[PDB]
């Protein structure tokens, strides 16, 4: 982006540019962040259980959809649904946009 | 090494800087066909503890009578050890 990749022949770029490639994808929502959460909301609660392992420790509010095989323990904010349902996948997900910006201002 | 030995050798050195320093030939010319007597060659009892072939080297730094280097004066241990630091101009580890 900035005038820095101009160094090293037309090839090196790919090396450092590839590094970011993954970084961004993995560290998607955090770029702005620089401290800690406040109330994480995961999607596939059960499956993404390991993603809550850290939550249960601190105590950060946890909300997520739990199917019939989910683990209603880690999540301190019960809310079933379906980790599937190609159509209902965003349903409850949309009711979040409101709570956020379109609910705080 | 051994100071007692080092010194014992030092003697074997000064003597050359005396007898051999010049008188070495004062009899030499009278030794090879240059007629020519034998008296001098007979009463030849001046160079005893003195001989241009009885002086050893010993690592200048230390005093090891082995593993000496003319271009230097020390033995493998010191030389290498020193060269490592750089007490020798232009002596990088060779590697063709």
């Amino acid at each position: 982006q900035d005038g820095t990749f101009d160094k090293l022949t037309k090839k090196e770029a790919l090396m450092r540019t590839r590094e970011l490639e993954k970084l961004e994808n993995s560290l998607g929502g955090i770029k702005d962040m620089g401290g800690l959460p406040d109330a994480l909301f995961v999607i596939d609660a059960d499956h993404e259980h390991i993603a809550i392992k850290e939550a249960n420790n601190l105590g950060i509010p946890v909300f997520a959809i739990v199917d019939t095989n989910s683990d209603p323990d880690g999540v301190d904010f019960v809310i079933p649904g379906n980790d599937d349902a190609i159509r209902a996948v965003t349903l409850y997900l949309g009711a979040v946009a409101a709570t956020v910006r379109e609910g705080r201002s | 090494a051994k100071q007692s030995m080092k010194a014992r050798e030092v003697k074997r050195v000064a003597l050359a800087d005396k007898y051999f320093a010049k008188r070495a030939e004062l009899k030499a010319i009278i030794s090879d066909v240059n007629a020519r007597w034998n008296a001098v060659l007979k009463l030849q009892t001046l160079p005893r503890d003195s001989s241009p072939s009885r002086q050893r080297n010993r690592c200048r730094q230390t005093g090891r009578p082995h593993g000496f280097l003319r271009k230097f004066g020390l033995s493998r241990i010191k030389v290498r050890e020193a060269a490592m630091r750089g007490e020798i101009p232009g002596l990088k580890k060779a590697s063709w």
Partner: protein, 206 residues
């Protein structure tokens, strides 16, 4: 010996010599002694002077020298007194009227031998090698260092069995030619033995 001398194979690049001049089978011989002789007497006295290195050159029938001391002041004394006195030592131990001078060494806590001779004395000074080398030695790190370390020897403390302590910070890749690291040693004769020191001070790569 697993690791060789990180300073040996460095006289070529990223690391200067210590006696740059010229000499053949004839002079090189007597010359090798000279550079030695001086550094011997000079050090003994320049001990408390905090030395880092002693460069030696030779323009013609005389040596140059460059006492790399972290505090040449002591080397001066009554202003010229001390220096002058020693300035004669060389002219006599060199065989020819040689010049002289110095170049103080700032940031001495980031110099091999300096730091080495530093931690080696603390011993006789009754100190805890560990608590010392992991502190009153690693200080170089504080100075925005890139990497450093020290590897003691055996007979550490009142032990009857030789050993070696670790403790290190940063990175000291004594394999990278460009890397460049400051190496030195000091056989601090311990009250009950003779421990050694090995300071690895890497200040930037190439």
């Amino acid at each position: 010996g697993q690791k060789v001398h990180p300073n040996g194979i460095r006289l070529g690049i990223v690391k200067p010599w210590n006696s740059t001049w010229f000499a053949n089978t004839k002079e090189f011989a007597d010359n090798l002694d000279s550079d030695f002789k001086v550094r011997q007497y000079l050090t003994k006295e320049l001990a408390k002077a905090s030395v880092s290195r002693i460069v030696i050159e030779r323009p013609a029938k005389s040596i140059r020298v460059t006492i790399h001391t972290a505090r040449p002041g002591i080397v001066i004394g009554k202003k010229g007194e001390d220096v002058e006195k020693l300035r004669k030592v060389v002219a006599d131990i060199a065989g020819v009227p040689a010049q002289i001078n110095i170049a103080e060494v700032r940031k001495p806590e980031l110099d091999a031998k300096l730091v080495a001779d530093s931690i080696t004395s603390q011993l006789e000074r009754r100190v805890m090698f560990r608590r010392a080398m992991k502190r009153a030695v690693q200080n170089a790190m504080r100075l925005g260092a890139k990497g450093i370390k020290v590897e003691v020897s055996g007979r550490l403390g009142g032990a009857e069995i030789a050993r070696t302590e670790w403790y290190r910070e940063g990175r000291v890749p004594l394999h990278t030619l460009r890397a460049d690291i400051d190496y030195n040693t000091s056989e601090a004769h311990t009250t009950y033995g003779v421990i050694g020191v090995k300071v690895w001070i890497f200040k930037g790569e190439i």
